[PDB]
From Swiss-Prot, chain A:
Gene it is expressed from: rpoB
Annotated transmembrane regions: none
Family listed: Belongs to the RNA polymerase beta chain family.
Source organism of the structure: Escherichia coli (strain K12)
Protein name (database record): DNA-directed RNA polymerase subunit beta
Function summary: DNA-dependent RNA polymerase (RNAP) catalyzes the transcription of DNA into RNA using the four ribonucleoside triphosphates as substrates.
Disulfide links within the chain: none
Swiss-Prot record, chain B:
GO molecular function: DNA binding; DNA-directed RNA polymerase activity; protein dimerization activity
Keyword set includes Transcription: yes
Annotated family: Belongs to the RNA polymerase alpha chain family.
Free-text comment about domains: The N-terminal domain is essential for RNAP assembly and basal transcription, whereas the C-terminal domain is involved in interaction with transcriptional regulators (such as CRP) and with upstream promoter elements.
PTM summary: Acetylated on Lys-279 and Lys-280 in the presence of glucose. PatZ controls acetylation of Lys-280 but not of Lys-279. (Microbial infection) ADP-ribosylated on both alpha subunits by the phage T4 protein ModA. ADP-ribosylated on only one of the alpha subunits by the phage T4 protein Alt.
Modified residues (ADP-ribosylarginine): R247
Modified residues (N6-acetyllysine): K279, K280
Gene this chain is encoded by: rpoA
Domain of life, per lineage: Bacteria
Sequence segments annotated as region (Required for interaction with Crp at class II promoters): 157-160
Name recorded for this polypeptide: DNA-directed RNA polymerase subunit alpha
Curated annotation (Swiss-Prot), chain C:
Name listed for the protein in its UniProt record: Right origin-binding protein
Top-rank taxon, per record: Bacteria
Residue span, HTH araC/xylS-type domain: 4-100
Organism expressing this protein natively: Escherichia coli (strain K12)
Function of the molecule: Transcriptional regulator. Binds to the right arm of the replication origin oriC of the chromosome. Rob binding may influence the formation of the nucleoprotein structure, required for oriC function in the initiation of replication.
Location of this fragment in the whole protein: 5 to 120 of 289
DNA-binding region: 21-42, 67-90
Underlying gene: rob
Amino acid sequence: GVLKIVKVYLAVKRRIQPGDKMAGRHGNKGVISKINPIEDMPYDENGTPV
Amino acid sequence: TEFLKPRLVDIEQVSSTHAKVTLEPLERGFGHTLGNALRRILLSSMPGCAVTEVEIDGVLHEYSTKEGVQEDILEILLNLKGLAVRVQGKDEVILTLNKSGIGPVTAADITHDGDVEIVKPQHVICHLTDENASISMRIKVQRGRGYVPASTRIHSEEDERPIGRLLVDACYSPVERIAYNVEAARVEQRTDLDKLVIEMETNGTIDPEEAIRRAATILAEQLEAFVDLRFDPILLRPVDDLELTVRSANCLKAEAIHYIGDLVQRTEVELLKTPNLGKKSLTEIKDVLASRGLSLGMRLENWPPASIADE
Amino acid sequence: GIIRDLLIWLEGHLDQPLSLDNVAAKAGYSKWHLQRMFKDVTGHIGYIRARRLSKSAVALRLTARPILDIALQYRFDSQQTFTRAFKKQFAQTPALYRRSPEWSAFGIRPPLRL
């Protein structure tokens, strides 16, 4: 019944969004909620923030 | 009042990538008032240059592979991100690269311009492994701020792009890590005053005084706003362009009348007595004068603009 | 002298302005006086019909639209009123005229370039 198959391939890129599951190696699940800028992250005495 | 203002002291550069800069003397409670307020501004909206697009031969898309390379193609994207260029007079430039032979291309290899100051010579781009290879890449450089990686540029603007251009994810911010510490400045009667030691660790492409001087241009713009803040269309056309019948209006422009304001300021009795008017053209003159609301010989104030041309 | 201006406006307006003699009376003068003012100039104006039949005849052969637009584009009354004018002038059916691969000057009235 078929004449021929045409089957194309598409690739994508995907980054951290709200609602993207996130966990360590101990069962500590997490919904990533909010993406904060670098200033309003808490920062140590020597500059490099959390 | 017993006010006081702080001033420039010094700039001590460790290198192009590290420096320190003081500021003194502030009064009580002022050191964190201006101190953190710059740390939130020198990271947020400090403008600088970055890499916007790359176009490159022999490859049609970033997820292919190129012959004669060690690292992959989007690793060249993830190495051309951390380049640092200081453009003096252009918010858009280009640079070309032509390279052959086995050997790692560094930033010295690219063909420069007279006004893009290069910061790092050896920020490693690629690795060549076969001698017959050749490279043509054209690195677009813009100057902006923030982390808009032109993914909104493709999403706010839908121009017809040519096939072959690769879009770079860019961070325009030159400032990386900035912190401060507040020690007591010594004025003999005012022991309460303090200093504002301000550090800075960035890449190149920045003079630090311009960073601090641009901050007060930002703040005092908002700090001003809390102190200071608390004619008929068919009358203005040619007589030929009034859109009338066969011969009623173009007969009027051989009287040199090429504006409708000049029409209403002629005597009707002697305009219809020239040997070119016809006696059924009378009603079209009576049309556009009565439909608009004008009288015979009534003086219009200024019928021409500063543009005055005939045919 | 004066009604020169009627000649090539009529080359341009056999179109959307339906111009009759009373609409041609908008050229300054009366219904009856424009006739003899056009007569001793030309010999032959209501020429207009020829232009309407000539001016419709640009649509048969040189544009691809069918026949029903043509009898109402260039200011004729109806599709029989067109072909009544067509058969009195060109002695053909326009379905026997355009479909024919040959075409020559038998009935098409020339425009007046006096």
